[PDB]
Each structure stands twice: as C-alpha cells, then as structure tokens.
C-alpha cells in the first residue's frame, strides 16, 4: 500500500543510502528510470546485484504518460520502489508524480540521496552564492535557445554563481561536453554581445562527482575550451565574483591559475 | 594515510550512503562534528554502532582552530574519517579544511550525503528556480542581523524562490524554528518596510527532511507563524513566482490555500 521514491545518488551503485537500500530490498516491486540522467559509474546489472531485485526500467513516456497505469496499480496491494538517479523530486517533473499517487489514493514516501545540486559544493564555491540554474541545450532547425545565457548574466550581475546542466540524450547515450558547452556559449555571446561569456570568463568544470576521483578543474575559457575533462556527464559552472576563500580553493584543489586571485576576487 | 570527509545525511544514521558506510568502517580513526546541523532521528551511540567505531566528536573551536593539530596529524600513518550531518561541504566552511589538509601533504576525499539543499525538492518547488540562499541568524545583544531580508527581496524581484537556513547554537542545544524565523522577519519588515515579508506572504516550511514523515506545510505567514511544525531542524522558504504545478503540489501535498493556484 506504499510507494517509495528512492534516489540512487551521483555515480555508482554504492551512492544509494543505507536507508534507500534496506527499503528497496523489502519492496515487492522495483522500478527505475534513466532518462533524466545516467549512472555513469555503474551498470544496471551492478545495481540489481546490490539491491538483489529484478529492476524494471521505465521510459520517459512510461513515467510521464502511464505512471498511474504501470507503477501505482502495484502499490495498492504491494510496497513499490521507484528509483531515480540523484535525489528524488529534483527533476522538475517528478514532484507531480506524487500528486498522481495521492490522487490514486497511494501513500508515498521519499528517501533522499546525494544530488549534484549539493555535490558541486566540492568545487569550493559557497552554496548560498548559487543563483538560478539552467540547462544548455543544442540549437536545432530554426530553433536557437539562449535563455541559459540570460541566467548567467542575471546571476553573475548579482555576484551569484550559475550551475549549468549540459544537454543529455539519455536514450542515445550522448552527452554534451563541457567543451561543446563552452563553444555554444561563445557562439551565443557573439550573437547577444553582453560580455557575459568570453575567452576571459572564468569557469569551473566538474565531472564524475560522487566518484572518489572526480575531475574538478577551474580556469579561463581560452585555456579550458579544448581541455580533456574525461568522460561525461560534465557540469559547467560560471562563478560570480569570488570570495578569497573560494578562489584559494579553486587554486589549491581545482588547479586554477594564481591570476584569479587578483582578477576574480 | 588519508582523510575522508563523509556526510551522514539528513535525519538518521541510515541516510549515510553505502559508500560512506563501508569506508568509515575501514578507517583507523573517526572524527565528527554535530554543530553545523541537527540529525533529529539518531544519536552518537547508533552512529558509532552502525560504523562499528569510536567517534571522537569535535567542537567548532577544535575544528576551526585545531583541525590541522587534531585531525591531519593522524592522517599520515592512518586512514582518518571526518563525519558531519548532511553533506560535509554544503553551507559549511569545511571546504577550507581541504586546503589545510593539502598544505599538510594529506590527500582528502569527499563522500557526499543527502543535503537539505536538494531535499527542498520535496516541497514541490522546482529546484532550478531557487535563487541566492541565506541564513536567518539569532540577534546577539544589540546586534540584529538583517541581510537575509535583502536576499529574499532580490530573489523575489527575479521571481526566484529563497532558501533560508535557520540558525543553530549547538552548545546551547537551540535550533531556530521556522516560527522564530517568521517573527524575526516581520520585525525586520517593520524596520525596513520594504514590503518583502508580511502577514500575507506565502511561505513553505520543511521540518525534519529525511524522516519518513517530514512536515511539509505552505500558506500565508499570518496563519503559520503560530503553527506547530514539530521538532527541529526546520528551514523556511519564501517562494518567488509559482508555476501552476508548483502551486498544485503545495495545495495537494503541503496543504496550501487553493487561492494560490491563481499564479498571476
Ligand atoms: N533534515 C533537515 N530538515 C530541515 N532542515 C534541515 C535539515 N538538515 C539541515 N537543515 C537546515 O540547515 C541548517 C544547517 S546548514 C548545514 C547543512 C548541511 N551541510 C546539509 O548538507 O544539509 C539547519 O539549521 C536547518 O535550518
């Protein structure tokens, strides 16, 4: 008679919480989705072996169109789990799935797990300084979206950091790169010319957060745009003016140039 | 011969990730602090029991003044772990401790945990629409902090939600309730009169995130400022402009007034 939204965490099969696991193991049915994001540090197979349960994967339309016909029904006579990467309800559409459950007269509980939203704290940037967040999307056809560029301007203007999620084709397993993203932002700057993103903009790239060996690199576009950050997914962040302690952290941990100590503080 | 920053999670000792549990288990020395936040659903004894280790609990002074004297030293000949509530680097100054470790030639690793910063997702408010965050601090003597007021103001002009961490005086065992925060804000409103936080302001309260039954309530200040949201810890959120589905969640799940649907 219960539905459990359980987060899988950041990178691999051990990023689930001890709570999430013990609850997942005692569920009659376990569903999962990997369209919002991919657990790039593990496999479906490794997740099932840790949870010790057959895991039925769900497509975007499985969830968004038929959540109440695929998942909810089983919750009336059973305890059901719904696993998602990161922290549940972070993806903007997932919270209404709870409204669906209430509507179908189903009890729903949320078991949290690490999200990149809090994990970027490893970049050294202060969490209270992050402003609005956005996603960089590919242009295509006659559509050239650039709102994420305005988010950067409005945040940085107010001395706040911008967390930038990169385009993902979960299903086709193709990630946007930090590099790709920097090129796109450069192209946008040339269209709008607002001084928001240029070769001298300082940025932070975070890759494989959650892993014991993530990649935290900080520097100016001109030096980073062709750097090898590794395998995806990448997270791009455009900091606002830094607190000296943030810059020292980017220098000593993320390998940023001494120059940001006098340029970006 | 390494140091690990391992988050313990939101509510009880089970909010630790499987990765953090199996690593803290094999560490020679385990340190911890419980002054940056409150894990309402557990005790030191159960953490210890679950980790299978003795946890030396540090104070803010131990940490801020003697981290390099208490903890890094043991890191050259042993594997040391430093536990904290929620996520170790979020809304703490712990990231600076990594610098100390490096400057002492001690490599450090971070094991994340569920943080209250992303748990806000359970309020139904889109996490990307949150703007600059702030902390509501207790007035000390003649000193009355008010900067958090301007933060709410900036975000709301932008239409973004504001996350308000609430103060904590761990040594006195005092945890600011959302009620207390709402009262502090009202008097700042009388002070500044910037029409930012009034009796008619819609707010959201999230209490004890991480537990199976957190308290999630939304509604106008006048109705909530005296309401009992249960034990600490609490956070207070002053949303910006709502999306209809945000508002639908707040009404269906957090018990807000239907009128808030009319999202202008
Ligand atoms: N489980 C929880 N429920 C509600 N608020 C919480 C909470 N845990 C922390 N907070 C809020 O955040 C403040 C501590 S701020 C430090 C946050 C911590 N590193 C994390 O990752 O969560 C508290 O005073 C309180 O206002």
From Swiss-Prot, chain B:
Q: Pfam families, from UniProt?
A: TP_methylase
Signal peptide range: none
The enzyme's first-digit EC class, named in words, is transferase
- The protein's Enzyme Commission number: 2.1.1.98
Give the GO molecular function terms: diphthine synthase activity
Gene3D superfamilies this protein is in? Answer: Cobalt-precorrin-4 Transmethylase, Domain 1 (3.40.1010.10), Methyltransferase, Cobalt-precorrin-4 Transmethylase, Domain 2 (3.30.950.10)
Q: Does the keyword Disulfide bond apply?
A: no
Gene Ontology BP annotations: methylation; protein histidyl modification to diphthamide
Q: Does the keyword Methyltransferase apply?
A: yes
Binding of S-adenosyl-L-methionine, residues: 10, 87, 90, 115-116, 166, 209, 234
Q: In which pathway does it act?
A: Protein modification; peptidyl-diphthamide biosynthesis
Record keywords, A-Z: Methyltransferase, S-adenosyl-L-methionine, Transferase
Q: Which reaction does it catalyse?
A: 2-[(3S)-amino-3-carboxypropyl]-L-histidyl-[translation elongation factor 2] + 3 S-adenosyl-L-methionine = diphthine-[translation elongation factor 2] + 3 S-adenosyl-L-homocysteine + 3 H(+)
Which NCBIfam families does the record match to this protein?
A: dph5 (TIGR00522)
Q: What else is known?
A: The diphthine intermediate is not stable in vitro and readily eliminates the trimethylamino group. It is not known whether the elimination reaction also occurs physiologically.
The family classification in the record reads:
Belongs to the diphthine synthase family.
Assembly mode: Homodimer.
The protein's name is Diphthine synthase
Q: What is the lineage of its organism?
A: Archaea, Methanobacteriati, Methanobacteriota, Thermococci, Thermococcales
